[PDB]
From a paper:
The metastable nature of cleaved, fusion-competent human immunodeficiency virus (HIV)-1 envelope glycoprotein (Env) controls the critical structural rearrangements that are required for fusion between the viral and host cell membranes after sequential binding to the CD4 receptor and the CXCR4 or CCR5 co-receptor. The gp120 subunits of Env house the receptor and coreceptor-binding sites, while gp41 contains the fusion machinery. The culmination of this cell entry process is orchestrated by the fusion peptide (FP) in the gp41 subunit through its insertion into the host cell membrane. The hydrophobic FP at the N-terminus of gp41 becomes available for fusion activity after proteolytic cleavage of gp160 into gp120 and gp41 by a host cell serine protease of the Furin family.
For crystallographic studies, the B41 SOSIP.664 trimers were further stabilized by binding to Fabs PGT124 and 35O22, which increase the melting temperatures by ~5 °C (to 62.8 °C) and an additional ~1.5 °C (to 64.5 °C), respectively. The trimer-Fab complex crystallized in two different conditions, and x-ray structures were determined at 3.50 Å and at 3.80 Å resolutions in cubic (P23) and hexagonal (P63) crystal lattices with data complete to ~100% in the highest resolution shell. B41 SOSIP.664 (3.50 Å) adopts overall protomer/trimer conformations, similar to previously determined trimer structures from other isolates/clades, with Cα root mean square deviations (r.m.s.d) ranging between 0.6–1.0 Å (protomer) and 1.0–1.3 Å (trimer). The FP, which is fully resolved to A512 at the N-terminus in the P23 lattice, is in a conformation that points away from the C-terminus of gp120 and is sandwiched between HR2 of the neighboring protomer in the trimer and the light-chain (LC) variable region (CDRL1 and LFR3) of 35O22 (from another ternary complex in the crystal lattice). The FP turns upwards and is stabilized through polar (H641 and T644) and hydrophobic (L645 and V648) interactions with HR2 of the neighboring protomer in the same Env trimer. In the P23 structure, F522 exits the interface pocket and the FP and FPPR regions rotate with M530 acting as the anchor. This altered conformation due to loss of the F522 interface interaction does not otherwise perturb the gp41 prefusion state. On measuring the angle between the center of masses of Cα atoms of gp120 and gp41 sub-domains (either excluding or including the FP) of the two structures, we detected a small outward tilt (~1° and ~0.5°, respectively) in the gp120 subunits of the B41 SOSIP.664 trimer in the 3.5 Å structure compared to the 3.8 Å structure relative to gp41. Although small, this tilt angle is sufficient to induce an ~1.6 Å opening at the trimer apex. In the closed prefusion B41PGT124+35O22 structure, the FP is largely solvent exposed (and stabilized by crystal contacts) and extends away from the trimer core, whereas the FPPR faces inward as seen in all soluble Env trimers.
Author numbering:
A (entry chain E): 2 to 9, 11 to 27, 27A, 27B, 27C, 28 to 95, 95A, 96 to 106, ...
B (entry chain B): 512 to 546, 567 to 664
C (entry chain H): 1 to 82, 82A, 82B, 82C, 83 to 100, 100A, 100B, 100C, ...
D (entry chain G): 32 to 140, 151 to 184, 188 to 308, 311 to 321, 321A, 322 to 355, 357 to 400, 404 to 407, ...
E (entry chain D): 1 to 52, 52A, 53 to 72, 72A, 72B, 72C, 72D, 72E, ...
F (entry chain L): 6 to 67, 67A, 67B, 67C, 68 to 95, 95A, 95B, 95C, ...
Write the structure that this text describes.
């Protein structure tokens, strides 16, 4: 994309943050109109700033639009937990069409930590009948962005058949993730216990299941 | 008549019917400008008297607002957002007069008095009070 | 191509049934219409009725109470009989081949059309006299040539004395001679009977060996008289 | 960035309402003397070129059945009849008993014209004369003496003045200054729904006030296919107005060369009766091209078969109506014909195609003629049409026709369509299905960023 | 208010074409433009074009001016100020990099300087372009596990495994149970097949008064699975 | 009721009207009758003539109403002099049973002519029946008017004289005869008998004497 935004940006709770959007003379700011879209991953975006500075209908006055002859700026004041998502700018005129930018991912600092919720499931009996075995370890309700998962067979690392999902965002401004461990019934029956270890930057939660039970 | 090019945009007005499009070139002008005891003699007379009455009502409202000879008169009465949340661009670039009337039809009778007392009743007193000196 | 011939008695006693017949030689009787028209002396033609090809009658309203028409299918002949005849029913009768015509003056479904007949073929015409009086036969007298004019043109004839009815047929040499013949109309003698004669103008070169014999044929008296005319 | 109210005079805002319109004709009297009574000589003459504004991006609901324009036009036609027959001669002294004979013609295989004789008081009150006149059969009813007039017991009778003419002249309905007529311009417009394309006009089009039963004449032709219009087609009791694209040419005549006999009945009130007939005797008829009526009925059965899945069975006509309702009554040359539309509605179709039809014969309908009429189901004054001298001939285009779906018991009786006007006003609804009357409210307030010059 | 409902997710082989629908309601379909915006993982959001339902004018981006055919149907009036419309877009010569979500968007203002701007967006039409074939999912029941011994709550659900088309729908009791349900995103296996899970937290004492049935529908394979989750658990924390 | 007369010049064109004029569309027929002879149809349809009818005759067809049905003859000769009948078939009338009133056509204007007389005495066989009748023939005379005067010797007879009313023959001339009844003794007693046929200006006489 020729329209470049800031890669990432961050501000504190109740503080203010600023996103930049600029590019070449074909997409320059002096003559083209700049719009802004809050585009959460997976959901439909929402217009917030239709012209350089006029905000979309029903948009809080916390969102301000400014544009210089060399860079357009979006400013989010009095940040909220829901203001942490992806944002895109569009460059256009009255007759042309949109030109979307690279995108900016805003982070909200000054937060309250959330204890993660881990749950581990053993493979069902119907799955073992088909000579398949898959472990299900679910994570949800954690505010810190990233989570790391490490599987262990009888307290020993596992490196085969480990597929972990990227962390998504919950409807309650929290986050969630999932990790799966495909196994064979020979490896599932010849072990005393399997463990799902979830590690955060402040605490490491461990949950263990045993094939004997 | 006898007006070509230099006058032909004069016929194509702009800012008048700018609230969207539920009109045309003479939708404004079809009403403002298109003016023996039998059944046709009595029905026509009641039609002519009704036309005059409906005309003098509007012009009287215009007179009691300080807007008699004017088509676009501004006023000193502010716009209360209880009547409308929308901005000037949400109104004049997104709605037609037909549906804007339908929205403000609730407070339309109220604003008529506000136009009468809060200004042209006050203006004609303030202007007479200050022309004493 | 259609020829008609009328045959009848000629004399009818009053208050009786006059009959007649009309023989056709052209075509079929079930193919045409037929009608009778009588001719009384001193009056106009009179239509008495007609018969269709499907043979259903309807007559003139004045004579309808006394006239009957019937056609024969085997013999191409048409019969006409008249009940309670008087001397007025005295007339020359005509059988004629009539033609039905349709004159349309509007739409056919709502009627608006009338039929009209016209007789395009007429017979010779027979005469029928109604009276109580009897027949009187004629007598033929020869007319000797004046033993006449220059160029050898002589004129002979044969006389017919008083006869009761005017219907008379006269021929010469059984019809062999036709040039110069001139039959004269009958004169009603005060005796109540008529009498005509005929003349023939022949050259004097053949006036000696002519052997002319005029043939007088009469039907009501049933007598046929031949007479030789010699100088 | 503040907001102050600002008033605007001349905004394109209208509300639906009803007002008293007025007529608008084209020609007057010095070019055509005593020319009309339906569209009188008095209303405003139409402007040379009409102004029509086509309203873009506009969508509004119309309704031909709840429209008040047909109510006003209906009462305008009714009231225009009273003001014309009011000064003309009343035929009160003509209900003496009638010695009537039939017309004289040859025997056939009854008569329509009759021949009545009666005595009436002369212009001198004490003296009395006996007169003869030929009244059509549908004008006399028996009571030694044969007949009387038909309308005597029912109501009074008034003879229309012979100077006036019963010609439908295009009359326009114009809304007063301050109102407007919105006109639906959709090629196939539903009965009552939204019109995607709307126009506005000060007046209507040339609506000939053609009074007619069972068939609509000289109307407006839809321009694509044919249109079926009903307020509720599933409801059998709702009349069905039809509209054609190619009108069928009709031809009618009264061939009898009648005469005008003036019988003096009162002081300066010369009554006119049918004198002796001249020339041939034949009834009145109407010719309709069979090739055109088959295609027309072919186009009608198609749209009907699209509204009904099982293709039903074709219809016949004319139950329950003794006089005016069953016949195809319509004026021509002055006389009121009453046709028998059995040749038109005696058909049966299935899977389109055809049946019950066999060349290029003019379809003939035996049309009876009357002179005593009480129009619009009105109790009271009935008009006596004066006799017309000479032979009468006319022709008209039939643009629409009124039908009526019949329902039998509860179910499975199968359905036909009896033509018949559900009301008199249905003739006007065929021409006012698109026009609606609305009022203009031109004052509009709206917020701008301008403030009037401060108090000074 | 105004709403836009597109067609469902589809799968097409590289080389074929696809035609996505967008059926609008709530507003006058002819008053505002209709934009088409797609988002692929390789290039982020990308604007394709818009069309004017009123006039029929269209404006296509140079990267889509040879392989996109936009059309609209005529509006059907609802009231005098609303209608129902239908806009269509047809992409031809699909490639693998065309895989992503496709959106239709209602214009912003009738007149001005940003009329066509994408304002009201559609719910998304995920289009995947691959050479493989559609694979139906296999559903396994998840045994109940203990969530809070002192709180008396548990958690049970169903498991979806190895299905190739991306769209996935999970409902409980045919939509009757909507509270407490939590569905997770899919995982990308090395073989190219997706898998995810769905769990719902319910009180432990609700075993003999409520029936829990998960309804997994995989429409690209046209398969409906209705599994009954066995309420009998094997966790020691929940047995107490 | 009876017959009506008509006088037309020779060779000129004639116009025979028709009684009881038409009320509606008419279908008139025109018959040409001669007393004692057969009527001949000239015109069946108002304008149509069957085969054998010469082109001299012509009828007025009712293309436009108001015309009156007139039979027109051109080049009138002596052979056209005959009774004419007009049959009226119109739509308003019923079944017209009676034919029309006959029109007695008479023609005038002809060249001079002189008759030929042939008086013959009573034959011998007639005298045997105690009767005797003189017979005087008249042939080819110019006009019908003729007066026959008999002369017994030089004295008129005046008794028993019977004469013909002149009737026309096939040669378009008239023919007549005159007879004189006598007794056989009155025929033999007189020297000669004279039949004087006075015609117009001239007067011819024939004389025959007993043997
Ligand atoms: C509505 O629908 C109705 C119903 O269909 C229509 O009704 C029609 O009304 C008219 C009124 O004029 C009737 O007209 C009459 O038609 C007859 C018949 O004509 C046809 O036949 C002629 C020959 O056939 C005759 O001879 C044969 C043997 O050869 C016989 O077997 C027959 O029976 C017939 O006797 C033929 O010559 C005609 O051709 C002429 O007409 C046609 C079509 O009209 C033209 O195409 C031709 O070019 C040509 O012009 C025809 O094929 C006519 O004979 C009647 O006309 C005479 O009578 C009138 C009465 O007043 C008179 O005024 C006319 O001048 C005319 O007179 C002519 O004939 C007389 C002898 O017959 C002469 O004396 C005279 O001088 C002249 O020569 C008459 O016109 C239709 O029959 C009737 N239609 C039907 C099918 O019933 C109605 O028209 C429709 N329209 C409207 C708006 O109402
Ligand atoms: C019924 O309601 C409709 C709403 O759905 C009304 O449509 C609206 O009409 C308004 C009045 O004109 C417009 O203001 C409004 O939006 C406008 O959009 C304009 C852009 O499109 C115009 O120009 C284009 C130029 O064409 C070239 O460039 C494009 C670039 O994308 C390219 O794709 C083309 O192929 C071409 O090369 C064109 O695409 C458009 O069709 C349109 O007008 C042209 O086409 C029409 C129809 O064919 C033709 O008749 C015209 O003559 C043109 O050729 C903007 O430019 C415009 O803003 C400019 O103008 C305004 C003036 O008010 C000014 O304020 C701005 O600053 C700027 O200068 C404006 O944004 C339009 N909306 C839509 C979506 O239709 C309709 O008018 C209405 N009818 C009635 C009866 O009123
Ligand atoms: C010109 O004029 C037209 C109409 O006159 C106008 O169009 C309308 O714009 C409004 C803008 O709001 C649209 O109305 C809705 O706005 C709500 C806002 O949500 C917040 O506010 C409401 C009210 O305070 C709260 O109840 C709510 O909780 C929020 O706090 C939107 O939520 C509606 O959006 C729908 O689609 C969104 C897509 O982003 C979804 O996020 C949202 O959940 C809504 O979903 C709808 O569709 C879903 C798909 O089927 C369905 O699941 C949902 O149940 C729901 O039906 C919506 O935008 C309105 O739709 C527009 N249309 C009409 C005809 O009114 C223009 O905006 C105006 N132009 C300008 C510039 O002013
Ligand atoms: C619905 O109503 C319409 C209008 O009335 C009917 O259409 C008429 O139908 C009738 C039959 O019911 C038709 O009448 C027929 O006419 C035929 C004439 O055609 C011949 O002759 C003409 C010349 O006159 C030629 O041009 C033509 O080419 C033909 O050679 C007659 O032949 C028929 O005869 C039948 O009826 C008569 C009288 O009853 C009998 O004597 C016969 O034996 C035979 O049975 C018949 O008269 C009439 O022509 C149609 N009119 C039109 C406008 O065409 C529909 O038929 C009717 N549909 C129904 C009842 O279902
Ligand atoms: C031809 O005319 C018909 C009327 O004679 C049109 O009928 C439409 O039929 C639909 C059937 O769904 C009606 O919808 C009903 O609406 C009522 C309540 O009406 C209110 O809501 C409708 C929403 O459509 C709105 O249009 C009305 O103005 C009212 O605000 C409901 O109770 C029913 O459940 C049902 O939804 C329509 O009301 C009716 N008319 C329309 C569309 O205005 C038919 O559509 C016409 N066809 C064409 C091609 O023009
Ligand atoms: C919406 O309604 C309008 C009004 O009818 C339609 O426009 C009309 O389209 C016709 C098609 O030919 C035009 O025809 C014209 O006729 C006039 C005579 O009246 C003639 O002078 C012109 O030269 C032309 O032939 C006509 O311009 C036009 N109506 C008007 C105002 O004349 C329109 O078609 C309807 N719907 C749409 C969007 O098409
Ligand atoms: C009802 O009456 C009307 C009018 O009286 C009849 O219209 C006639 O229709 C025919 C159709 O062929 C017209 O013929 C035309 O002739 C002209 C001149 O040769 C030719 O150029 C055309 O191509 C055509 O062939 C005829 O003129 C017309 N009559 C008029 C206008 O007077 C109609 O047939 C009648 N319909 C019925 C009885 O249903
Ligand atoms: C229909 O009936 C009328 C009568 O009501 C017929 O009109 C009559 O036509 C005749 C001509 O045959 C007229 O005679 C004319 O009289 C005028 C003076 O009045 C004279 O100038 C002419 O030379 C001629 O003699 C008669 O007056 C007239 N009667 C009227 C007008 O009352 C008409 O012919 C009939 N038409 C048809 C087609 O049935
Ligand atoms: C159309 O024609 C049919 C022909 O039968 C009519 O049917 C008859 O209707 C009468 C009156 O209701 C019934 O009494 C008869 O029983 C019906 N027919 C038979 C033989 O059962 C029908 O009424 C006609 N309808 C129209 C549309 O006029
Ligand atoms: C307008 O006023 C009426 C009064 O009954 C009220 O019912 C309606 O809700 C009001 N509408 C608006 C749009 O304010
Ligand atoms: C009028 O008289 C006629 C004939 O007697 C009769 O049939 C009819 O019912 C009467 N009408 C009224 C309302 O008296
Ligand atoms: C039409 O009639 C049917 C049956 O009575 C009724 O159910 C329906 O509501 C009616 N519809 C209209 C538009 O009148
Ligand atoms: C009427 O139209 C139908 C269908 O085109 C056809 O089959 C039939 O023969 C037509 N009938 C006549 C009389 O033209």
């Amino acid at each position: 994309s020729v329209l470049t935004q800031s890669a990432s940006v961050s501000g504190s709770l109740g503080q203010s943050v600023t996103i930049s959007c600029t590019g070449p003379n074909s997409v320059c700011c002096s003559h083209k109109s700049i719009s802004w879209y809050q585009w959460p991953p997976g959901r439909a975006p929402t217009l917030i700033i239709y012209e350089d500075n006029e905000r979309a209908p029903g948009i809080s006055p916390r969102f301000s639009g400014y544009k210089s002859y060399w860079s357009a700026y979006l400013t989010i004041s009095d940040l909220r937990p829901e203001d942490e998502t992806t944002y895109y700018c569009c460059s256009y005129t009255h007759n042309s069409g949109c030109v979307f930018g690279t995108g900016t991912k805003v982070s909200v600092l000054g937060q309250s930590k959330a204890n993660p919720s881990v749950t581990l499931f053993p493979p069902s009996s119907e799955e073992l009948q088909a000579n398949k075995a898959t472990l299900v370890c679910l994570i949800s309700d954690f505010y810190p962005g990233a989570v790391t998962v490490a599987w262990k067979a009888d307290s020993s690392p596992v490196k085969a058949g480990v597929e972990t999902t990227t962390p998504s965002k919950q409807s309650n401004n929290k986050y969630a993730a999932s990790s799966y461990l495909s196994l064979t019934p020979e490896q599932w029956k010849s072990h005393r216990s399997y463990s799902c270890q979830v590690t955060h930057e402040g605490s490491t939660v461990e949950k263990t299941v045993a094939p004997t039970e | 008549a006898v007006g070509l090019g230099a006058f032909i945009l004069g016929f194509l007005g702009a800012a008048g019917s700018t609230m969207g499009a539920a009109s045309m070139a003479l939708t404004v002008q079809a009403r403002l400008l298109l003016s023996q005891l039998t059944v046709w003699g009595i029905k026509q007379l009641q039609a002519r008297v009704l036309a005059v009455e409906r005309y003098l009502r509007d012009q009287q409202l215009l007179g009691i607002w300080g807007c008699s000879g004017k088509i676009i008169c501004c006023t000193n009465v502010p716009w209360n957002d209880s009547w409308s949340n929308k901005t000037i661009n949400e109104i004049w670039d997104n709605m037609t007069w037909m549906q804007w009337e339908k929205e403000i039809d609730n407070y339309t009778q109220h604003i008529y008095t506000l136009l009468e007392v809060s200004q042209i009743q006050q203006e004609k007193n303030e202007q007479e009070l200050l022309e004493l000196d | 191509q259609v020829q008609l011939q009328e045959s009848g008695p000629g004399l009818v006693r009053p208050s009786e049934t006059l009959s007649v017949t009309c023989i056709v030689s052209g075509g079929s009787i079930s193919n045409y219409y037929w009608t009778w028209i009588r001719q009384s002396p001193g009056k106009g033609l009179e239509w008495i009725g007609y018969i269709s090809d499907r043979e259903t009658t309807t007559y003139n309203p004045s004579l309808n109470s006394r006239a009957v028409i019937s056609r024969d299918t085997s013999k191409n002949q048409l019969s006409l009989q008249l009940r309670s005849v008087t001397t007025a029913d005295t007339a020359i009768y005509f059988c004629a081949t009539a033609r039905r015509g349709q004159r349309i003056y509007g739409v056919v479904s709502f009627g608006e059309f009338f039929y009209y007949y016209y007789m395009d073929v007429w017979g010779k015409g027979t005469a029928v006299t109604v009276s109580s009086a009897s027949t009187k036969g004629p007598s033929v007298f020869p007319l000797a040539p004046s033993s006449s004019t220059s160029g050898g043109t002589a004129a002979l004839g044969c006389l017919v004395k008083d006869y009761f009815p005017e219907p008379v047929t006269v021929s010469w040499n059984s019809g062999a001679l036709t040039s110069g013949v001139h039959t004269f109309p009958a004169v009603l003698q005060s005796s109540g009977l008529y009498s005509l004669s005929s003349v023939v103008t022949v050259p004097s070169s053949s006036l000696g060996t002519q052997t002319y014999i005029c043939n007088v044929n009469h039907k009501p008296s049933n007598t046929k008289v031949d007479k030789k005319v010699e100088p | 960035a503040k907001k102050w109210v600002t008033v605007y005079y001349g905004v394109p805002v209208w509300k639906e309402a009803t007002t008293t319109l007025f007529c608008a004709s084209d020609a007057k009297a010095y070019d055509t003397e005593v020319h009309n009574v339906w569209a009188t000589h008095a209303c405003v003459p139409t402007d040379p070129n009409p102004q029509e504004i086509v309203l873009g991006n506009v969508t509004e609901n119309f309704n031909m059945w709840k429209n008040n324009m047909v109510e006003q036009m209906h009462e305008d036609i009714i009231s225009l009849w009273d003001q014309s027959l009011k000064p003309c001669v009343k035929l009160t002294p003509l209900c003496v008993t009638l010695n009537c004979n039939n017309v004289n013609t040859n025997n056939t295989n009854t008569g329509e014209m009759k021949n009545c004789s009666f005595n009436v008081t002369t212009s001198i009150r004490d003296k009395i004369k006996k007169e003869y006149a030929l009244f059509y059969k549908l004008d006399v009813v028996p009571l030694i003496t044969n007949y009387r007039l038909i309308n005597c017991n029912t109501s009074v009778i008034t003879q229309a003045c012979p100077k006036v003419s019963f010609e439908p002249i295009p009359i326009h309905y114009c809304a007063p200054a301050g109102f407007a007529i919105l006109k639906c311009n959709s090629k196939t417009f539903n009965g009552s729904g939204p019109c995607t394309n709307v126009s506005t006009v000060q007046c209507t089009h040339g609506i000939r006030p053609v009074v007619s039963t069972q068939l609509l004449l000289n109307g407006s032709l839809a321009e694509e296919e044919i249109v079926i219009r009903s307020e509720n087609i599933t409801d059998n009791a709702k009349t069905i107005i039809v509209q054609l694209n190619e009108a069928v040419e009709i031809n009618c005549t009264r061939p009898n060369n009648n005469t005008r006999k003036s019988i003096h009945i009162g002081p300066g009130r010369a009554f006119y009766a049918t004198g002796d007939i001249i020339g041939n005797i034949r009834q009145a008829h109407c010719n309709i091209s069979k090739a055109r009526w088959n295609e027309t009925l072919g186009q009608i059965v198609a749209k009907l078969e699209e509204q009904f899945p099982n293709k039903t069975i074709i219809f016949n006509h004319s139950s329950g109506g003794d006089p005016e309702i069953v016949t195809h009554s319509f004026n021509c040359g002055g006389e009121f014909f009453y046709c028998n539309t059995t040749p038109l509605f005696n058909s049966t179709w299935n899977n389109t195609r055809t049946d019950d039809y066999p060349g290029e014969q003019n379809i003939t309908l035996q049309c009876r003629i009357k002179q005593i009429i009480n129009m619009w189901q009105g109790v009271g004054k009935a008009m006596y049409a004066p006799p017309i001298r000479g032979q009468i001939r006319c022709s008209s285009n039939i643009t629409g026709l009124l039908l009526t779906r019949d329902g039998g018991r509860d179910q499975n009786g199968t359905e036909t369509f009896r033509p018949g006007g559900g009301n008199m006003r249905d003739n006007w609804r065929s021409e006012l299905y698109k026009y609606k009357v609305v009022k203009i409210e031109p004052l509009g307030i709206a917020p701008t960023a301008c403030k009037r010059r401060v108090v000074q | 208010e105004g709403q836009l409902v597109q067609s469902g997710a589809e799968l097409k082989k590289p080389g074929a074409s696809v035609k996505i629908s967008c059926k609008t309601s709530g507003y006058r379909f002819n008053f505002y433009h209709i934009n088409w915006i797609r988002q692929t993982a390789g290039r982020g959001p990308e604007w394709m074009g818009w069309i004017s339902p009123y006039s029929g004018d269209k404006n296509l981006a140079p990267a889509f001016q040879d392989r996109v055919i936009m059309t609209t149907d005529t509006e059907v009036p609802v009231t005098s100020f609303t209608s129902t419309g239908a806009a269509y877009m047809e992409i031809r010569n699909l490639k693998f990099d065309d895989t992503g979500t496709y959106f239709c968007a209602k214009g912003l203002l009738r007149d001005g300087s940003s009329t066509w701007l994408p304002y009201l967006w559609g719910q998304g039409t995920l289009l995947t372009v691959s050479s493989a074939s559609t694979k139906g999912p296999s559903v396994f029941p998840l045994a109940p596990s203990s969530k809070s011994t002192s709180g008396g709550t548990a958690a049970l659900g169903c498991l979806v495994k190895d299905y190739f088309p991306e769209p996935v729908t999970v409902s409980w009791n045919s939509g009757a149970l909507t509270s407490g349900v939590h569905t997770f995103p899919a995982v990308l296996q090395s073989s190219g097949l997706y898998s995810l899970s769905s769990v719902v937290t319910v009180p432990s004492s609700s075993l003999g008064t409520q029936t829990y049935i998960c309804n997994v529908n995989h429409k690209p394979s046209n398969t409906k699975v209705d599994k009954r989750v066995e309420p009998k658990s094997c966790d020691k924390g929940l047995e107490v | 009721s009876y017959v009506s007369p008509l006088s037309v010049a020779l060779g000129e064109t004639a116009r025979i009207s028709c009684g009881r004029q038409a009320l509606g569309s008419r279908a008139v027929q025109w018959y040409q009758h001669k007393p004692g002879q057969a009527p001949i149809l000239l015109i069946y349809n108002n304008q149509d003539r069957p085969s054998g009818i010469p082109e001299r005759f012509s009828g007025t067809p009712d293309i436009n109403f108001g015309t009156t049905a007139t039979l027109t003859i051109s080049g009138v000769e002596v052979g056209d002099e005959a009774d004419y009948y007009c049959h009226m078939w119109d739509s308003r009338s019923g079944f017209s049973w009676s034919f029309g009133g006959a029109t007695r056509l008479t023609v005038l204007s002809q060249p001079k002519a002189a008759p030929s007389v042939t008086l013959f005495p009573p034959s011998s066989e007639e005298l045997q029946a105690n009767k005797a009748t003189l017979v005087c023939l008249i042939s080819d005379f110019y006009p019908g008017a003729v007066t026959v005067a008999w002369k017994a010797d030089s004295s008129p007879v005046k008794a028993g004289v019977e004469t013909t009313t002149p009737s026309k023959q096939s040669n378009n001339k008239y023919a007549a005869s005159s007879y004189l009844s006598l007794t056989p003794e009155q025929w033999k007693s007189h020297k000669s008998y004279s039949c004087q046929v006075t015609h117009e200006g001239s007067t011819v006489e024939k004389t025959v004497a007993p043997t």
